[PDB]
Design a protein around this nucleic acid. Structure first.
Lengths: 114, 122, 69, 141
RNA sequence: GGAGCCAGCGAGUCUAACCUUGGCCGAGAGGUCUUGGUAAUCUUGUGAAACUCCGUCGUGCUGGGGAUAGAGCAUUGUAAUU
């Protein structure tokens, strides 16, 4: 099975957010201690409904919130992440925990001198 | 008596060098890690490596791979709070470049920027 | 080749007979015409001076100067 | 008569450090041999056992010659240059945690006491002790 | 690595939170309780670095040199992912 820093996945998902941060590295702990803004709450509300009403996957919800931390509540959702130009679509696998959303959508094109 | 070459952790170490510095040939054993381990082993730091007896090269090895048992302060270690299980480790010899070349592939599997850019450059 | 860093009985015997021959001795001299490493030479001089075989005229850690007497 | 001012610096300090170690009352922190003493240093102190006594002696003399001192000034005093890799050198302060325990230790054996206007000042027993070692150091000549 | 130990030109809050001594905690970065100064007055003798003395190293890309890279701990900011 997958495990996150010694906690098994089946005990995750039941875990609350404020429990999760206790395991997280320093940057995450500071971010929540300094008070995360209201903006994630509006996103999470919309994200929850799409999952609850899902026919089986929830289909994409899309956002500009590149600076948002991935938190176990949102595992298995499908999200379209803006790139400054286009949307890239990604599904939240458990391996992604603790990264920023911005790490999955590349703002520039590789240069080849071709 | 004196032995010009010795082998431990699958690495060769020559006897002609001060013990603290000789040990740094092993991957993961820096100057400070080497220095503290010798003190905890209570070996004579001024001896050259070829002078030590077998039961002194043991105990040394028996500490390097179990540092937390001898209350080395954990903040000394190079693998604190491991990603899979929250243990603290020190990585030695060929085990280095196996956790490296693993976290890189772990990033590649998850389509993270740092993984993508790394392998694309290759 | 490499300089010796541990003292064999042969060189120990060699040191005691050869050193009284030289007008001037220093770390550099013992490393040159004998073949011991610098870490031995610093030990040898303190021993030979204590033993009374060589005479000091000045000591400075970064230089040392001993004479035949 | 004789005063501490009559004796060479790195001669008084060696004598007093050797004396102070033999008495065995000076309490050591126990984390000794791990600590670098400075964030600017590389490698820990080279004299593994003795170095704590050497510093204890140095602090006592430095206070004796002065009106009073505090922990912050000691960190400046023992600071040094840090290499900063490829960038140019800069001045950096020494460890606070070492110096603070040194002062606390000397205070228990009564050489030093807390001054009004802050910091530490020499005790009259500190004067009497250091003056005795000074006399012995000259007499040994 | 340990010990010795010396400057000159600046700049600083009530509009409110600037320069910060001293005590305590911490390996460190840093934290915490108080305090002086609208300044030749307090920070500040800005106890700066090279430098001097005593030891270890011994000519070997070496204990010279520290790029590139992994893991973790803090601080500024509404926000540190490239």
């Amino acid at each position: 099975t997958h495990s996150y820093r010694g906690v098994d996945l089946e005990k995750l998902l039941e875990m609350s957010t404020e429990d999760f941060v206790k395991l997280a590295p320093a940057r995450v702990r500071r971010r929540f201690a300094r008070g995360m803004t209201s903006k994630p709450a509006g996103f999470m509300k919309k994200l929850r409904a799409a999952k609850l009403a899902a026919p089986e996957k929830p289909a994409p919800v899309r956002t500009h919130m590149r600076n948002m931390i991935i938190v176990p509540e949102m595992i298995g959702s499908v999200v379209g992440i803006y790139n400054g130009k286009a949307f890239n679509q990604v599904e939240i696998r458990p391996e992604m925990l603790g990264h920023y959303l911005g790490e999955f959508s590349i703002t520039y094109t590789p240069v080849r001198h071709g | 008596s004196f032995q010009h070459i010795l082998r431990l952790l699958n690495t060769n170490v020559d006897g002609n060098i001060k013990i603290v510095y000789a040990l740094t040939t092993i991957k993961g054993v820096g100057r400070r890690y080497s220095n503290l381990v010798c003190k905890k082993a209570d070996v004579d730091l001024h001896k050259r490596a070829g002078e030590l007896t077998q039961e002194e090269l043991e105990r040394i090895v028996q500490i390097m791979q179990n540092p937390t048992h001898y209350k080395i302060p954990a903040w000394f270690l190079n693998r604190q709070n491991d990603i899979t299980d929250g243990k603290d480790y020190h990585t030695l010899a060929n085990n280095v470049e196996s956790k490296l070349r693993d976290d890189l592939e772990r990033l590649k599997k998850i389509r993270a920027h740092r993984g993508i850019r790394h392998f694309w450059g290759l | 080749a490499q300089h010796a860093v541990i003292l064999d009985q042969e060189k120990y015997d060699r040191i005691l007979k050869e050193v009284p021959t030289y007008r001037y001795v220093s770390v550099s001299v013992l490393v040159d015409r004998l073949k011991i490493g610098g870490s031995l030479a610093r030990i040898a001089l303190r021993h030979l001076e204590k033993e009374g075989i060589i005479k000091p005229i000045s000591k400075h850690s970064k230089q040392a100067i001993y004479t035949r007497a | 008569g004789v005063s501490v001012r009559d004796v060479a610096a790195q001669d008084f300090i060696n004598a007093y450090a050797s004396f102070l170690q033999r008495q065995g009352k000076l309490e050591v922190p126990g984390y000794v041999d791990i600590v670098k003493t400075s964030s600017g240093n590389e490698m820990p102190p080279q004299d593994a056992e003795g170095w704590f006594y050497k510093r204890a002696a140095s602090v006592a003399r430095h206070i004796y010659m002065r009106k009073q001192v505090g922990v912050g000034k000691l960190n400046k005093l023992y600071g040094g240059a840090k290499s900063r890799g490829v960038r140019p050198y800069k001045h950096i302060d020494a460890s606070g945690s070492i110096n603070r325990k040194v002062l606390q230790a000397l205070e228990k054996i009564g050489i030093v006491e807390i001054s009004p206007k802050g910091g530490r000042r020499i005790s009259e027993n500190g004067q009497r002790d250091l003056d005795r070692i000074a006399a012995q150091t000259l007499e040994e000549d």
